[PDB]
Subunit: 263 residues, 4 copies
């Protein structure tokens, strides 16, 4: 099957940032024809730790910027919703509606996404056990979703730390396509006090682990200059490294694929 790579800047800092990142993703989609690229970026960070952190420029602006990426680069789009009413308008541009980790249990939000007809990707809550996502998929199917994804993004391990239990990949694959979020999996929630931290040095090794185990795609946030990102600056991958990382996971996936267990 076609491997999915969801990538883009964490937040829509500006329409210009999106086009800059989108141009590279478009170039990569031309080379890596066996990959299905989906451009990602949030029109709003509705769950920042601090009231003083960057949130975004609103839904209207965000959708407009995302539509510009799809229009100019012919790229598929995905962004996350935070309250039920946002589903309808976001569905106008988003091919995949993303459900935030903390909100993976909010029935109304899941139902709102499901009835749009768009695909739905649920970030697995840090409080959820792999087998607890079965009910998440059931809600979505009940709501009309035909294309469902579950994203592994780490589990609460003590305070301000997350661990990735790779056993979750084959488990969640029993009821949905599985995506591995390579950048949030290394973040240290609230690690910096007023903001979450992260350990970039582990992004690549853990992504190699994910593809060796077997998943249906990877989620990677990238920015031209991570250090200047208005959000998740500790975990966003330098745009220049995207190509190399993608080539690596395709190679590892190929050599490992024959050993992937049938679920």
């Amino acid at each position: 099957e076609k491997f999915l790579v969801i990538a883009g800047p964490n937040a829509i800092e500006s329409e210009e940032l999106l086009l800059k990142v989108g141009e590279e993703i478009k170039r990569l989609s031309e080379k890596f024809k066996e990959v299905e690229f989906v451009f990602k970026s949030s029109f709003d960070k509705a769950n920042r730790s601090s009231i003083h952190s960057f949130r975004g420029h609103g839904l209207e602006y965000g959708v407009k910027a995302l539509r510009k990426v799809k229009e100019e680069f012919g790229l598929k789009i995905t962004t996350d919703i935070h309250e039920s009413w946002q589903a309808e308008p976001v569905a106008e541009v988003a091919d995949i509606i993303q459900i935030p980790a903390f909100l993976c249990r909010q029935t109304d939000l899941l139902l709102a996404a499901a009835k749009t007809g768009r695909a739905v990707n649920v970030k697995k809550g840090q409080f959820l056990a792999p087998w607890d996502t079965k009910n998440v998929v059931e809600k979505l199917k009940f709501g009309g979703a035909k294309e469902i994804y579950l994203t592994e993004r780490g589990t609460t391990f003590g305070y301000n730390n997350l661990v990735v239990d790779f056993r979750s990949l084959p488990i969640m694959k029993q009821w949905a396509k599985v995506i591995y979020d390579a950048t949030h999996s290394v973040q240290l929630p609230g690690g910096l006090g007023d903001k979450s931290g992260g350990m970039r040095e582990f992004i690549f090794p853990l992504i190699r682990a994910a593809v060796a185990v077997g998943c249906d795609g990877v989620f990677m946030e990238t920015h031209p200059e991570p250090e200047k990102a208005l959000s998740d600056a500790s975990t966003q991958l330098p745009l220049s490294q995207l190509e190399g990382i993608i080539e690596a996971i395709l190679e590892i996936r190929e050599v490992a694929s024959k050993y992937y267990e049938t679920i």
Copy 2:
């Protein structure tokens, strides 16, 4: 004075709310040293299963809660799940409750603060005690003046929660602290299509809460927990409420002498 938040988990009917409210009123008259606040959710917006009980709607819920406040003269508290619900709920709710999974949703917090009502935030199972400082800050920015933080357990491996009592003194640095004696013993998704829990530990842990030191306790109670349409594994039998309250007042009286300052 000591705060005691109690009532049925979900508003299964205003009939249920009146029966429980009646007992809470009787206790209210018996323990003048305590401030009772009646709690009940008009909607369970985070059930594990799509087929589980959610409720009868915000309008039915607000009406029933209003009945309780008018008939028993009890303060009210219920939780909201989306920003637009803050305003209508503020009509009856003396304290607006913010769900644990939603403790980081800025718009929900601000919406609650805007109503001018008191705000009680359930500490997320994914949050560290010190991470709540930022939660309180958002609320103050939103104009909230009476803010509470509720301990309800922390993710400990899969389908299990642990109560780190160090959180009580830590959170006390920036807000009034409440101990949720009901959900702290629940086992998330432990029953497959529902969450479980161990009632035998409710009392022991609540005794620990007052020995450590907290500004109040949160306890869900139902006449027949077994028949509850929600959180049946953790809800306390209405008949046992009085005994537990008297017990925590006694322990608090003696232990309060040692509560550390600030």
Copy 3:
């Protein structure tokens, strides 16, 4: 029943330190007649994180120093063993043989303590679940132990941190007398890099929690000047505070006792 208080300096830094601490414990045992005091101190710290940390002055010296405390103050004694052969000689002075947390599963060590005829107190491993201690008691009974204690000293919670799940008290009470270790429960394993850290400000509050829940005794390490301790300096209680803490737990125990559930 008579409440047990196990206290003393973490390690036998010198015979003089033991006598100094012992004099205070003797004085307290005279006032708190309803309490059964047991003097504790390790003749060896066999599990320090660093090879450069203080271990002790040997078994022979340690036993001699402990015997001096029992002889001079008529106090009961308890110390921990690390290998099977130490049981016999330690049993000569120790009324209660303590089994280290990391060693709570070493069958031979448990058996060695059990056959001495002395009481045995097992520190619950940081890797053990409350219900896993049942088999620990079974081994001891099999080995001849008639007086068994299980000590709560925290559970691994993420890295370099421990949490106390007070549900363990009523659970372990099903098969043994339960002791709460008020000082190790607040330590941060390896928190200081080459040594473990600790948070003293939580010692008293958590001990209040333990007695409110209900236990058969408390374990508290104390030192005249914690800051100068050659081990566990972050968690040892100033000797001057011992009396106050003891009085407090007796008061809380009394008021709470009528509510203690029958196991």
Copy 4:
């Protein structure tokens, strides 16, 4: 070259050791790119139950292991539990293994280092990856020159272990790293009087280990795990060993190009 530690968990009999040793020898001849080390414990000193299988003694165990080394010319590794066992075991063991629960016992570590043999320490379920720096230091102080650190899971709530693969690169800073594919999927005391485990995850996680990067893998194997007198829930069927090894060599070959330096 890549290290592969394999063999039956416990020395149930030298007969069992010879049968398994025979297959490991055959693989040894088939994969010259790999260095095989035969493993088997002469004693299970940490069983949950007093009634469970422990072994036939150090003398019987050392003799059987010596048979394996002499008949198949395979290096040997077995674990010790008390300081005095280091010396006699060093007679046959090329690598002395230190049990996870005992990774902080200074005298055990020093005793192992003194023999001059290689030392492989199972990382305690209570240890953080960075805490192992001190473990290696003790061994160097004791005179050890060939030191390994083995990842075998970390305590994650009750009766469960999680593998934090970030530990591989972190521990690589001070020792050669081995991934225990067998015990990493075990569920401590999960079966009441014994530990459980989920075999279905052994292979997937071992693939992750080589993709991340490690100096070797540790896998316990038994002709009929079902009949094993120990760790029956995690031991790998002898027939499946070849396939898994070929698979990890292939993955390692491709992924090794990306192993980060230092």
